[PDB]
Enzyme design. Sequence first.
Site, PDB file in Angstrom:
ATOM      1  N   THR A   1     -45.962 -98.160 -47.170  1.00  6.60           N
ATOM      2  CA  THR A   1     -45.935 -99.096 -46.047  1.00  6.60           C
ATOM      3  C   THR A   1     -47.216 -99.205 -45.275  1.00  6.60           C
ATOM      4  O   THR A   1     -47.286-100.001 -44.344  1.00  6.60           O
ATOM      5  CB  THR A   1     -44.785 -98.815 -45.027  1.00  6.60           C
ATOM      6  OG1 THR A   1     -45.075 -97.647 -44.249  1.00  6.60           O
ATOM      7  CG2 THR A   1     -43.460 -98.619 -45.774  1.00  6.60           C
ATOM      8  N   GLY A   2     -48.248 -98.453 -45.661  1.00  6.54           N
ATOM      9  CA  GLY A   2     -49.508 -98.549 -44.920  1.00  6.54           C
ATOM     10  C   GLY A   2     -50.354 -99.793 -45.180  1.00  6.54           C
ATOM     11  O   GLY A   2     -50.044-100.628 -46.005  1.00  6.54           O
TER      12      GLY A   2
ATOM     13  N   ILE B   1     -56.259 -92.534 -54.859  1.00  7.24           N
ATOM     14  CA  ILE B   1     -57.358 -93.451 -54.478  1.00  7.24           C
ATOM     15  C   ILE B   1     -58.107 -92.830 -53.308  1.00  7.24           C
ATOM     16  O   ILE B   1     -59.348 -92.743 -53.278  1.00  7.24           O
ATOM     17  CB  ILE B   1     -56.753 -94.828 -54.012  1.00  7.24           C
ATOM     18  CG1 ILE B   1     -55.915 -95.433 -55.152  1.00  7.24           C
ATOM     19  CG2 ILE B   1     -57.831 -95.748 -53.386  1.00  7.24           C
ATOM     20  CD1 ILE B   1     -56.671 -95.637 -56.456  1.00  7.24           C
TER      21      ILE B   1
ATOM     22  N   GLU C   1     -73.550 -90.192 -62.619  1.00  6.68           N
ATOM     23  CA  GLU C   1     -74.523 -90.138 -61.543  1.00  6.68           C
ATOM     24  C   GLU C   1     -74.908 -88.682 -61.311  1.00  6.68           C
ATOM     25  O   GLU C   1     -74.462 -87.768 -62.024  1.00  6.68           O
ATOM     26  CB  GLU C   1     -73.945 -90.719 -60.269  1.00  6.68           C
ATOM     27  CG  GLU C   1     -72.554 -90.249 -59.955  1.00  6.68           C
ATOM     28  CD  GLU C   1     -71.876 -91.034 -58.800  1.00  6.68           C
ATOM     29  OE1 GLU C   1     -71.658 -92.272 -58.935  1.00  6.68           O
ATOM     30  OE2 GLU C   1     -71.545 -90.384 -57.776  1.00  6.68           O
TER      31      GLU C   1
ATOM     32  N   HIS D   1     -71.073 -90.844 -52.307  1.00 10.23           N
ATOM     33  CA  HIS D   1     -70.034 -90.018 -52.867  1.00 10.23           C
ATOM     34  C   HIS D   1     -70.301 -88.545 -52.454  1.00 10.23           C
ATOM     35  O   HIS D   1     -71.412 -88.060 -52.584  1.00 10.23           O
ATOM     36  CB  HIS D   1     -70.036 -90.115 -54.407  1.00 10.23           C
ATOM     37  CG  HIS D   1     -69.636 -91.464 -54.950  1.00 10.23           C
ATOM     38  ND1 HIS D   1     -69.888 -91.828 -56.254  1.00 10.23           N
ATOM     39  CD2 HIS D   1     -68.992 -92.520 -54.383  1.00 10.23           C
ATOM     40  CE1 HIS D   1     -69.433 -93.051 -56.465  1.00 10.23           C
ATOM     41  NE2 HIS D   1     -68.887 -93.492 -55.343  1.00 10.23           N
TER      42      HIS D   1
END
Lengths: 305, 393
Positions: free
Chosen positions: A23-24, A102, A216, A258
Site C-alpha cells: 500500500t505504500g 528493491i 563497477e 552505490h
Amino acid sequence: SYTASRKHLYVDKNTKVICQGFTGKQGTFHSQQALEYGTNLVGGTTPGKGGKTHLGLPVFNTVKEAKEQTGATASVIYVPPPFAAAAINEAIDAEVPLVVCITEGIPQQDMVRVKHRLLRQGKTRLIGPNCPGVINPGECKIGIMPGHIHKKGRIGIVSRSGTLTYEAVHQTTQVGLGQSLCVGIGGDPFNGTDFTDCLEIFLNDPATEGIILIGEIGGNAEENAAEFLKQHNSGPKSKPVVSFIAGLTAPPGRRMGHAGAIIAGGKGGAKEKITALQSAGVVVSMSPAQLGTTIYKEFEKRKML
Amino acid sequence: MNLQEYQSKKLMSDNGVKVQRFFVADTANEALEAAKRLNAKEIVLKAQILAGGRGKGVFSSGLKGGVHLTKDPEVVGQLAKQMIGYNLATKQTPKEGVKVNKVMVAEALDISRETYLAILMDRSCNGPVLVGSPQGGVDIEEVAASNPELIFKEQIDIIEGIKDSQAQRMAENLGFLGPLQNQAADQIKKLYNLFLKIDATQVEVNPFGETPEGQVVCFDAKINFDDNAEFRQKDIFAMDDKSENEPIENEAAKYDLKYIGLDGNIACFVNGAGLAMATCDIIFLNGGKPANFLDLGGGVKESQVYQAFKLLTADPKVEAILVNIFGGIVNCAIIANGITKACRELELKVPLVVRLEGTNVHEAQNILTNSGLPITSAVDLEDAAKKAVASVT
Ligand SMILES: [Cl-]
C-alpha cells in the site's frame, strides 16, 4: 543449498507475485506498472491491512497468509529501509521461492544478519537489496525497470546498476538482438545474488546465447565471475560474454552513489576487474556506449546472427 | 561521515574501550590549563583535523608537525597557540591546508608493543571479520605485502557473537601475554561490540598496544560509519561537522544529490550511480576531463535539476555540461522542460550537451531544440561525450 535456489531467478509467465509494502507510495506505483506490463501480481502485504483490498487485489498482514491464499511463488519488496531487512527475513521464513528486494538504504549490518540465515537454507532465492529487480521480457517483470525498452531475445544480462543496464538493454535493441533474462543484482556490498549466480543460469539456458555482464568498482564479485568463467565457460561450446565495468575514473576511498561502489585499501579498482574478466575470455567494451555493437560483433563472428 | 580523533576516542571510551586520558581545547590557554589539570609525566598535543598525516604536517604559523610531546604544560600552551586558528597541511589535505579550531591534550603513554587490529564486514566472507597483526604502527596493506604470514584472521559469526576463544586466540597471535592477553581479549570483545553498536563498516586500531606499566590501550583508531544506519545513529551523525568536506558536496547533499568532485572541466549530471560513473568515464575516453560525478538519484524534482545545475555552474572550472538522463519511468519532454526552465532561471551561460533517452525522446529533443540557450542535443552517449569534449577544446 542456497545455490539450489538459483533456479528461482528465472521468472516466467507462471510466476505469481506478491508485493510487500504493497500500500505504500513505491509499492502502489510499481504494482500498477507490473499489472499494466503483464506481470502476475495477485496480492500484497502491509502491516495492519489484512482484509482490505488494493489495486483490485487482496492485501494481507503476513506473507505466510498471502503466499498461502494466493499461490505466489515470488515476492517484491518496497518496504522502507528501517523494515526492509525484516521484510526479506519474513519472506524467507515463509519460504517464498524468489524474493526481490528493491529497497535502497538497508543498513549493511542488517544485510549481513539476513545473509547468515539466507545461506543456511535452500527454499528462498534473494536478489538485492538496492536492486532494480528481474525481468523475463514479455513474460514477467519484478522491479522498477522500464519494461517496454526490453525485447525478448538471446542475451542474458546481469548487472550491479539500474539505469546503466537500461542503456545496455536499449543498445542491444538498437541492433535487433533481445534479452533472454535480465538480473539487476544491485549496488549494495552484501546481497543475495551475485554475478556467478546468474552466469550459471545463463550458461545452462539454451535461450541465452550471449551474456552481458555490467559491473563497477568495489568488492570482488567481478573477479569471482572471471574465475567462474575461466572454469565453466571454456570449451568447444562456451558462450560469448561482453562486459563493461564502470568507475575507471573514480577516485579512491569515495562511495560513488552505490554504497558498494568504493575503492578501499587498494581493492575494488575497475581496471583489475577488466583485466581479470579479459583473462577469462570476456570481451570487454572499453566504452559503455558500445556494448550493443560489441556483442553484435561477437555473434557476427560466430555466425550466430 | 567522519569523526575527529577526540570524538571517536570519547565514543570508544564510553563503550569500555581503553584509550588515553584527554582534554579537548579551543584556545591556547585552555590547552595550557588542560595540560596542567592532566597532571601526567608526559603530554601529547594533537591538532584536530580529519585528514591523516598530521605528524608530518606543517601549520601556516611556521610550526612543523601536528603532534608534539612535552612534559611542560607551558610548552603545550605555547605550541597550541601556533596551531589554533591556523591551517595545517599534510600529505592528505589540500594545498592550503585545513583550519584547526581544536586541539587534544592527552597523557602520552609509553609503548612497548605495537599491534594492528581491525574489525570490518568482509565482502568476501559475509559476516564480521577480525583482522590483527603483531606488526603494528604500520599501514596494513604494507604488512600484507611484506609479511602476509603476520596477518591473522578470525571469522566472527554475526548471530553467535565473537567467542571468548576467538578474542583469546587473536590476543595471543597479536603477541599479548599473561594477564595482558586477557586484557587484550577483553578489549577486543569490547571493540567488536562497539563495532556492532554504532553500525561501523570498520573500526581500525593502530597501534593496538601495551604500556611497559601493564595496560592494553587503543592508542589511535579510525572508524568508518555505514551511512545507511544514520536513521538509527542520530547522535553519532549529529556529531558530523562537514567542515572538512568539499563545499559543493555539502551543498549537493542538502538536496539529496550525490556529488563527487573530480578535477576535470567537463561537468556531469546523470541519474543512476552506474550510469554516472560510466559518463565520467566515456568523457575521459574521448580526451576530456570530467569535473565531477553527480548522480541525481531517482526522485528527481525540478528543484533538484535546478540545484544540480546551480552547483555545476557556480564551479569556476566548469566549462561545459554533459547531462545524461535515462527516462524509462518519466517521459523526456517533461525532463527536457525542467532542464530548460532551470537553465533559463539560471541564465546558464556555459554550453550544455544533453543526452536524453527513454520515452518521447524525439519530442524531448524538440522541446530542448526549441530554446536558444547554449544547449545541444546528442543522439547517443558516445555522441554526447564527443560533443562535450569538442565544446571545451
Ligand atoms: Cl509488509
